[PDB]
Write a protein that binds this ligand. Structure first.
Ligand SMILES: O=C(O)CNC(=O)[C@@H](CS)Cc1ccccc1
Ligand SMILES: [Ca+2]
Ligand SMILES: [Ca+2]
Ligand SMILES: [Ca+2]
Ligand SMILES: [Ca+2]
Ligand SMILES: [Zn+2]
Length: 316
């Protein structure tokens, strides 16, 4: 759409009011011209055909219940772009300001969200296991992060390299939740999962075992489901990341925490410079050691906390 940039107001899935960047040309569109090549939000209209229609609204006000998921997918994708640009100096997912597109209201009672190789897609949930997926900042950044991986390391979605792919997305979606200061935590999906139950989440970075995921290499899933346990074995890498950051004793091994910022710096560098499509857990270890080395020196505490963390989860 070609038109005048303006700003509208709306209510998100959680009932919160926010301002969003729109474009005016007869109608008001969910098209934000201020970020790279633009952020575009689309209506999939309960169908599976993508992307659906560019979101059009008559008065620049987004307070209807059908509007809520479009408001949050549009705004959180702006926050995510901001995080990457400001913190890591990366312009959009390809590093060249590619336009970011999202479709909401995808299918009927679709309990997922994904990156299809070209855009982000959000189901509205069934109302019980989930509420519309874009209402969770960590879900939105997990997604966008898959775009980042795709253009960099290119981790294949299966087995060891696939679980690394999932871990990276949980790690960066968690960094983005803390960056926005939106009630942050080391849990994944908490804001949109099981609206009827309090206190839970889909996955836990602090204690993956809390929901049955492995928190040690020796407890890794060797089967075939979930592409070889991509969303299962990600817990081993999530635990490691949470240790480097915050510190702690796990299975007897003590790790001194180096905090979030350094954790984001080391992982981004492993991602962008050292990891390959076929990298395994052991290779992720050498990549993270080497990034921390590059940035803080071979004899830094930074390097020593990364080794401790991997030894704690049995990776190497
Ligand atoms: O597909 C699965 O098994 C679970 N899906 C996920 O973990 C991702 C899709 S890769 C979508 C999502 C991320 C974070 C939070 C909620 C939903
Ligand atoms: Ca309106
Ligand atoms: Ca939170
Ligand atoms: Ca969270
Ligand atoms: Ca819940
Ligand atoms: Zn994922």
């Amino acid at each position: 759409i070609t038109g005048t940039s303006t700003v509208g107001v709306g209510r998100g899935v959680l009932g919160d009011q926010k301002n969003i960047n729109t474009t005016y040309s007869t109608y008001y569109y969910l098209q934000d011209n201020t970020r790279g090549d633009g952020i575009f939000t689309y209506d999939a209209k309960y169908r599976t055909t993508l992307p659906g229609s560019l979101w059009a609204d008559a008065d620049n006000q987004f307070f209807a219940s059908y509007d809520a998921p479009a408001v949050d997918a549009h705004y959180y994708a702006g926050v995510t772009y901001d995080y990457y640009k400001n913190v890591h100096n990366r312009l959009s997912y390809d590093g060249n300001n590619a336009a970011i597109r999202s479709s909401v209201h995808y299918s009927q009672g679709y309990n997922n969200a994904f990156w299809n190789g070209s855009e982000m897609v959000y189901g509205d949930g069934d109302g019980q296991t989930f509420i519309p997926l874009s209402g969770g900042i960590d879900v939105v950044a997990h997604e966008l992060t898959h775009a980042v991986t795709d253009y960099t390391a290119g981790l294949i979605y299966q087995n060891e390299s696939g679980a690394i792919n999932e871990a990276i997305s949980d790690i960066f979606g968690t960094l983005v939740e803390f960056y926005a200061n939106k009630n942050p935590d080391w849990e994944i999906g908490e804001d949109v999962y099981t609206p009827g139950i309090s206190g839970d989440s889909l996955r836990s970075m602090s204690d993956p075992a809390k929901y049955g995921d492995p928190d040690h290499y020796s407890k890794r899933y060797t089967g075939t489901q979930d592409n070889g346990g991509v969303h299962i074995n990600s817990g081993i890498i999530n635990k490691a990341a949470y240790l480097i950051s915050q510190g702690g004793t796990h299975y007897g091994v003590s790790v001194v925490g180096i905090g979030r910022d350094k954790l984001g710096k080391i992982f981004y560098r492993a991602l962008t410079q050292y990891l390959t499509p076929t990298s395994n857990f052991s290779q992720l270890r050498a990549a993270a050691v080497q990034s921390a080395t590059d940035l803080y020196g071979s004899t830094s505490q930074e390097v020593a906390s990364v080794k401790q963390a991997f030894d704690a989860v049995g990776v190497k």
